[PDB]
Paper text:
Here, we show that Paracoccus denitrificans assimilates ethylene glycol solely via NAD-dependent alcohol and aldehyde dehydrogenases.
We performed enzyme assays confirming that EtgB is indeed an alcohol dehydrogenase that utilizes NAD+ (NADH) as cofactor when converting alcohols to aldehydes (or vice versa). The enzyme was found to catalyze the dehydrogenation of ethylene glycol, albeit with a kcat/Km value that is 300-fold lower than the kcat/Km for the conversion of ethanol. We also replaced His47 with Asn to probe the effect of this smaller amino acid on the active site and the proton-shuttling system. None of these mutations improved the catalytic efficiency for the dehydrogenation of ethylene glycol.
Residue numbers in the entry:
A (entry chain C): 5 to 332, 336 to 343
B (entry chain B): 3 to 331, 336 to 343
C (entry chain A): 3 to 330, 336 to 343
D (entry chain D): 4 to 330, 334 to 343
The structure:
């Protein structure tokens, strides 16, 4: 097998040859055919997060492919199913979160490519109770970003308490941003995109955004959004969480609205507690959703209502991709 | 004829006990004879004009004024004379926007506020909208029902927006008037109440009022670890009643993953926020002000059954400035009876 | 002055098109020059007086009267002299009961109804309450917006109380005056639609409007079996628009375990209900007839955005009786 | 060997047989049974008069509590000697939409205790470690067996009434489920009205926390009395013992927009006034025992001393007698220790 192993933090990933994993009880083995590249993989490679991985680990939580083995205890998943290995790898199974349909909040959970070896390889051992099952009518390259970006933005839009026909701003139309635009349009929600570029605003207009505001050349983007979204978006999905981005997001959401945050920035953002209380503003965090959310997002991608603009790549240029993310659609490694 | 009120002639200057004229009830408006008006930090902040949107002087503060209906407007339909009503913080609302039609009239924009945008309950008489006054339980005295109009409804709605259910842990941070009121409300909702405050007599007050877990912020290595230990993993809901600067960080540490932190205070300036922590833990941070008419009526029902009572420190109108002095360093309530 | 009005002089007798005094609004009231007026089976029942609570003749039926605001009473504050408004089923509410305070004025014990408890839209003028009249989008004419005051709001609220989410399955049964509106709303609200009806012109219309699944009730050995086949196990929401002993039983069969059955009709009599089946399957059965002011506003937003278009056949007042005869597509009494 | 009250064939007295003890194969736990509630579901499993009949010979009973006598291969979390229960739900598929949504009771390929696999009416029952309730330590097995079926059923039925603390829930038909539901709705911040055909049961409810009683027999109509003593109608109606009279009365008792939750499993159909049910906005939902999380929550209420089932101790060899007796105050719990 060939992987991209973070042997020591900070130093660039080296394309080594590591042994082929083999599944244990209730464990399947996936033959990766695509593997999305996310900024969470960059932060796992560098290691600048409170709780860190123990290198050498293989990153990547967007690996999709075939089941090439079942570890002799697996009941449902067959050998040939189109599966993927998302962020959530396992869970305890008995805590209040695992029992309430909220296993992403489990405190003993593992994370693919963070606490266990991930998608940046040919074969991965995964847990069949947590893998996502993929629709047939979608190729692996266009379904890999949905395993972390699609589910993240779908759950983020679900936690804004927004219904169809309500205004949701998608802030920072990147890869996650364009995926979120597609999901928000597929849910009946009016969309108002806000980014710093104008080509991305054109892309959002193509994707069903009826409102666009340039967050870099408008006098105040929040006033523009409140003008066009009938007095403030009912939900704001902040996709790339930065400063003046969280600020404009707080300014754009209408009273009683919800600011879902789908990024993991560093530092401590200021929060106008007075304004949040006076406006009844909810601010909620959400990293990639649960198994039901993943399944529903894969079903949105099986109807051709959400498509991921993907730039194919081999394994050997992963470093460059991280370089491209260090400076600043979606980069899917091509294992097929 | 004439009435006595605590007017704010200019911001930051001592409130003046004036003999202002009695307000008259406009068409669709009732006139209430105040009997016990509560004092809140909001009254001091309105008199001091230290908020982003400021009141317009001269104005009479006070949004916890309970009493009898002394007059009815030319057209009112459901509030009659003698109805023991209390004029809350939410004075009016437009009644046609997406918030007032949805039953979220406290989020409206054309809304007024008693004692802030209009004259309030620090007087012998007031003028209020009958569609927005609360209806008090007849088995509770005015002096004991005045704090419910702001403190009680604020903590009640704050507990309702924590999205907890009976049997869940709720940490009532900052046991002041709001803190003890919220302890009682969380007990009356079948929730297990952990209590955190720097003082200790207030922690014993929490103990008697229903709290089974009490943590002293001053004398623990870190209060959030004690809360997480004694609540089996962190409270499902945290209600920060006294958000000064670090109760917020302690609350964020106390809450469990997927839990909700509800803020009821109006502290100055901006507070840090571990967006990484709040996102990775699934935390929800929500801001809560008093609450709507349904929530006010529900809190009044709770105060009518005797499951929630406030410790009041009765005082007179002429002491208002002195009270405000004490408020620069137990819900204070004035007595017009 | 005088206006034309299809008065129900007494129950049983046919409607009498008469010259009746022009209704002048009073303190806190407005007047709506009725350009168009939809026709519903509720109006026929009011004309026939065959309900447990009956109207009080002579009364003017009609709860879909749209038009301009002609006059305003001394006191009105939000509507102006000439806005496109409509008078829906809900004419007033107490304002202070727990239902009104909670945003549920459709449940007020003291609600007045248009065309049932007070006069209505089957006339050239009406006196309505400005706090409860819907506000019409200006890009849709009265003829095509009259059905949205009863049918559109009814099916919108029914779909909302099915507790469904975008990507779910809702089975619309009875594609008629309500069913095609329901198909359009369920497609605009983001749900997968399955239509069920006895007729095949109705099924063709539904398949056009976005019903990915259509099953014929009378040309299928067992319909519910085929619906469950083509919905992966049944629908999370089942909207019964034409409530029948056949329709309700088939709806119970079609819904999935845990799903909701929304009954939007008002049939007569007492219907069978397998309590064992309901409890075992965890079925939920609700009943909603017309949505609230905010749900009306949301349905009007869907209508004005273009995502929902009623199919309308127009008439004049003078043949309302014939329509009532034909009451044994949505008829709209054009009188602009 | 054990003392299994086997249903060797449907319709016959249960043979008290010395069957072999089941063994904990891979991924399973074996429980030694110290107590076991008796429910009418067990009687209907014995008589097989339900649509999906069981398959004899089988051991009924879905309330068996005790210690984990043995742990099978692969099991990681449940230790031998833990106080576990074996509830109505035995297993689920683990991958369907209902399972992933926290609704594994709604599953299609689920198993049932004492209905589709051998159950609690024995000394040892082999259960699935992922679905066994984990009992508190301050409650006896004889007093915690009824919670596994009656307590969970009433708790979940109260939760699906979508009522909030301070609401009104009418508990119709005080029995085992009825009295446990009175206690649960009390421990939820809810006001509890009680309706029953006896009168000693109304006294028991009046003592267990209920504040409104109406005799379903000696009254001209229970619905009017309930509507008058709940101020317009109850927000929730938990129907514990369900019948054509009880269902009609419940639909009459509930306020508009309220939920009528059904816990019984009666044969046949029932009349539904669709005109009234649609005009009134009523919701008629049917609830069965409950999910693993709700079982945990019910056991937590039972441990904390807020819910106690009035257990009437029996032995194993008179189960048939109880079955005849079931053709009954409190919950007949067999004592197998
Ligand atoms: Zn990622
Ligand atoms: Zn867990
Ligand atoms: Zn206050
Ligand atoms: Zn408003
Ligand atoms: Zn009302
Ligand atoms: Zn209608
Ligand atoms: Zn049972
Ligand atoms: Zn399942």
């Amino acid at each position: 097998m060939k992987a991209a192993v973070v042997r020591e933090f900070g130093k660039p990933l080296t394309i080594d040859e590591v042994p082929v994993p083999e599944p244990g009880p209730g464990m399947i083995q996936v033959r990766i055919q695509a593997s999305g590249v996310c900024h969470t993989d960059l932060h796992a490679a560098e290691g600048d997060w409170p709780v860190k991985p123990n290198p050498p680990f293989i990153p990547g939580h967007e690996g999709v492919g075939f089941v090439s083995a079942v570890g002799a205890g697996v009941k449902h998943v067959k050998e040939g199913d189109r599966v993927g290995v998302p962020w959530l790898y396992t869970a305890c199974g008995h805590c209040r979160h695992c029992l309430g349909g909220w296993e992403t909040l489990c405190e003993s959970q593992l994370n693919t490519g963070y606490s266990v070896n991930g998608g940046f390889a040919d074969y991965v051992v995964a847990d069949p109770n947590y893998v996502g099952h993929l629709p047939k009518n979608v190729d692996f390259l266009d379904i890999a970003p949905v395993l972390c970006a699609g589910v993240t933005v779908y759950k983020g839009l679900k936690v804004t308490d927004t219904k169809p026909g309500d205004w949701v701003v998608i802030s920072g139309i990147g890869g996650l941003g364009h995926m979120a635009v597609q999901y928000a349009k597929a849910m009946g929600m009016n969309v108002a995109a806000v980014d710093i570029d104008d080509e991305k605003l054109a892309l959002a207009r193509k994707l069903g955004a009826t409102v666009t505001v340039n967050a870099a050349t408008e006098p105040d983007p929040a006033a523009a959004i409140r003008k066009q979204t009938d007095g403030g978006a009912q939900g704001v999905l902040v996709t790339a969480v930065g400063r003046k981005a969280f600020e404009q997001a707080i300014g754009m959401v209408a009273r009683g609205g919800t600011v879902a945050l789908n990024g993991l920035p560093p530092g401590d953002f200021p929060l106008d507690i007075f304004g949040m209380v006076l406006n009844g503003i909810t601010v909620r965090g959400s990293i990639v959703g649960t198994r039901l959310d993943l399944q529903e997002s894969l079903d949105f991608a099986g109807d051709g209502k959400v498509k991921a603009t993907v730039h194919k790549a081999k394994l050997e240029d992963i470093n460059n991709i991280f370089g491209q993310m260090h400076k600043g659609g979606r980069m899917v490694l091509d294992m097929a």
